[model samples]
Target: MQIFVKTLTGKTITLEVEPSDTIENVKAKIQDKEGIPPDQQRLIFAGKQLEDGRTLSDYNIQKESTLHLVLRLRGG
Candidate 1:
């Protein structure tokens, strides 16, 4: 399936991946494209937490879907 990934910084990345791919894969791809760390990555599908080991299939991600990958910033 081809998924569209959008960053909080307004960057868009599109890739074709298997449904078996995990959110971590998406995180890694986002990190590679945007240089964000794993800890700073927050992937939201619909509206829920995406655990690292969870696969896209587990999240019920559809074919030709667009997921929102937000890079969260925390301050003191």
Candidate 2:
């Protein structure tokens, strides 16, 4: 199935994934598109934050699940 990552910068990322895919894997995909790290990225689904080691299936993520991404900023 495919998932959507709606970023704060007005970019909607579509990723091809499976139910077995981990949230860490999801972060990697988003990182590829947005150049952000997993620790710095916030992935929220249905008001609950996603955990790294957890699988999409564990969270009841469906085909068209939407993940809200927030990039944590660090001082330069």
Query: How do the predictions measure up, each by TM-score?
Result: 0.77, 0.84
Model 2: per-residue lDDT, tens digit, 45-71? 888888999999999898998888888
> Per-residue lDDT for 2-76 in model 1, tens only?
888776678777877788888888788777766888788888887877888999999888787778877667543
lDDT of 2: 0.87
lDDT of each: 0.80, 0.87
Candidate 2 lDDT score at position 51 = 93
Error of 2 at 34 (Å): 2.5
- Candidate 2 TM-score over all chains jointly: 0.84
Q: Lowest lDDT 10-mer window, candidate 2?
A: 67-76
- Looking at model 2, residue 28 earns an lDDT score of 90
